[PDB]
């Protein structure tokens, strides 16, 4: 049914005060947490995790409310799906494993948890890697006609419930596949492992999972933006060494030169383009893995 | 479907781009009324009787909308650009012997209307636009707050078949959500239920929904481009113009409407109406009086 894409990795249900976090755990050495984004699950790391697990204890976690992680009940402020709250929940998850100081790589929504984590609790991180994002504040501050059309889902999925939930329910299989295909370099699903796509499609088939994603984007339009805004206005920078990777045809390159942007947010950032669309660890697994191995070593 | 224009005739007007449906009533100078999204000509059913006491009132379905034919679109969404719609409605009016006429438009119909007045000002005696700013102005003001407010401008402009596939799961929900969300009260109480049925029935047709997306695609691209050429060239509408907007409508959410319209029009007057977006249904008497006074001066 659902293919195990991490041969040799354990499977852990990590209890937190907000619900369980699901994780594949492999390797040995320093702890490294890998966080996926939308509309994916942890399995998006399946082609880069074995490379990392040669040198690290790799924890490949489903975000709160995504994949097989539990879905905490939201509220009017979408609090559990704010990146601040997800970061606190993942900090607690890592503590359950005895990891209070870990490396972190995130992609898409997971990268937003990751830099928020770095801003709120930089002591928790040795090094941070963000894949194909700019800070949420930067997307909203750069909002223009061009960007409104390109990341339309940022305003569409943030509409009040049940509007996106009902529309997404009109053709969920089409939408998740359209999102995967449209954001690759190829523009189709040929860069993905078909068994990974099945993981993404089955997760997107659940109306409750789709609601969580809308809660995520609702937080992204409101509370996440305000948390970022406070750090900009306070001049708060990420003091953790960080690597910013982005796809040459991805989402973050069209807004602004991502390395130039991230320097305003981080005091120690290196960056490199990857010949890829948005889904760096699947479209360019060897280049993405090499850059992550080099940086975290 | 109820007849909401008692005593009005029905006309099927052949044009080169397809038939235009219109209800025709009254006597006196010709006055073309144009609806918008997601409505049909029947949105004027409360105001057109009052207008018909003084004017020959032509209440037309936009090209592609309601009962008008649907030209096949193309990669540039040409038949549903306001420029093309304006030319087609000029043709329609010529078929009735109206080469100089008054024009009042709402929503998309108002976009046809001001584009008509820019392209062919000599066809218009006077022009009224209801609860819009020019398309250029909406895009130029597309920051975070406005992208969340009129998300549908960037959702419906997504490449086919994405909006089409999502709309098709529960069409009734979306058309009623759009009607309800843009009113003052936020429900359907301002609308005649017989009118709602007209709107719901039009929206239940997948080809009609495709046309609406094509309209919105044109709105994101060619319409914007056409407007952009005119603003940067300082081309102003020379036709005497009335700009009416709802105090709680869409146009006032981006800017103070009269200030904007004075940039686009050399002879524009304006009034707010206590109403949501759907002025002729939410505030029929106030709307009808403002139009009768403007068009008979």
Explained architecture:
The structure is a homodimer of 297-residue chains. Chain A is α/β, with parallel strands linked by helices and 297 residues long. The first copy, chain A, has a single domain (1-297), classed as Alpha/Beta hydrolase fold, catalytic domain (Rossmann fold, 3-Layer(aba) Sandwich). Helix content of chain A is 42%, strand content 16%. The first copy, chain A, is built from 15 helices and 8 strands. Chain A has helices at 49-52, 83-96, 109-120, 136-141, 145-150, 153-156, 163-168, 172-182, 194-204, 207-221, 223-233, 252-255, 258-263, 280-283, 285-296, and strands at residues 10-14, 21-27, 31-35, 57-61, 102-107, 125-131, 242-247, 269-274. An 8-stranded mixed sheet of chain A has the order 1-2-4-3-5-6-7-8, sandwiched between helices. In chain A, strand 1 and strand 2 (21-27) form a beta hairpin. In chain A, helix 2 crosses helix 3 (109-120) and helix 8 packs across helix 9 (194-204). Chain A is globular. The N and C termini of chain A lie far apart (36 Å). At the A-B interface, helix 5, helix 6, helix 7 and helix 8 of A face helix 5, helix 6, helix 7 and helix 8 of B. Chain B: It comes from Rhodopseudomonas palustris (strain ATCC BAA-98 / CGA009). Chain B: The record marks 131 as: Important for enzyme activity.
């Amino acid at each position: 049914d659902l293919a195990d894409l991490f041969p040799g990795f354990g499977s852990e249900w990590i209890n937190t005060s907000s619900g369980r976090i699901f994780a594949r755990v492999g390797g040995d050495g320093p702890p490294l947490l890998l966080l996926h984004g939308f509309p994916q699950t942890h399995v998006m790391w399946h082609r880069v995790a074995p490379k990392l697990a040669e040198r690290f204890k790799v924890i490949v976690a489903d975000l709160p409310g995504y994949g097989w992680s539990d879905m905490p009940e939201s509220d009017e402020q979408h609090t559990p799906y704010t990146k601040r709250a997800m970061a606190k929940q993942l900090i607690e998850a890592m503590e359950q494993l005895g990891h209070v100081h870990f490396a972190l790589a995130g992609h898409d929504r997971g990268a937003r948890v990751s830099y928020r984590l770095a801003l709120d609790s930089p002591g928790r991180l040795s090094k941070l890697a963000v894949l194909d994002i700019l800070p949420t504040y930067e997307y909203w501050q750069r909002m223009n006609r061009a960007y409104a059309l390109k990341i339309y889902h940022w305003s569409f999925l943030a509409q009040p419930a049940p509007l996106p939930e009902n529309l997404l329910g009109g053709d969920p299989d089409f939408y998740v596949k359209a999102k995967l295909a449209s954001w690759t370099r190829a523009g189709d699903l040929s860069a993905f492992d078909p068994r990974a796509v099945e993981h993404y499609r089955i997760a997107f088939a659940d109306p409750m999972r789709r609601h969580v994603m809308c809660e995520d984007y609702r937080a992204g339009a409101y509370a996440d933006f305000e948390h970022d805004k406070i750090d900009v206005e306070a001049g708060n920078k990420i003091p953790v060494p960080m690597l910013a990777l982005w796809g040459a045809s991805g989402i973050a390159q069209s807004a602004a030169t991502p390395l130039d942007v991230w320097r305003k947010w981080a005091s120690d950032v290196q960056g490199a383009p990857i010949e890829s669309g948005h889904f760096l660890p699947e479209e360019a697994p060897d280049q993405t893995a090499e850059a992550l191995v080099r940086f975290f070593s």
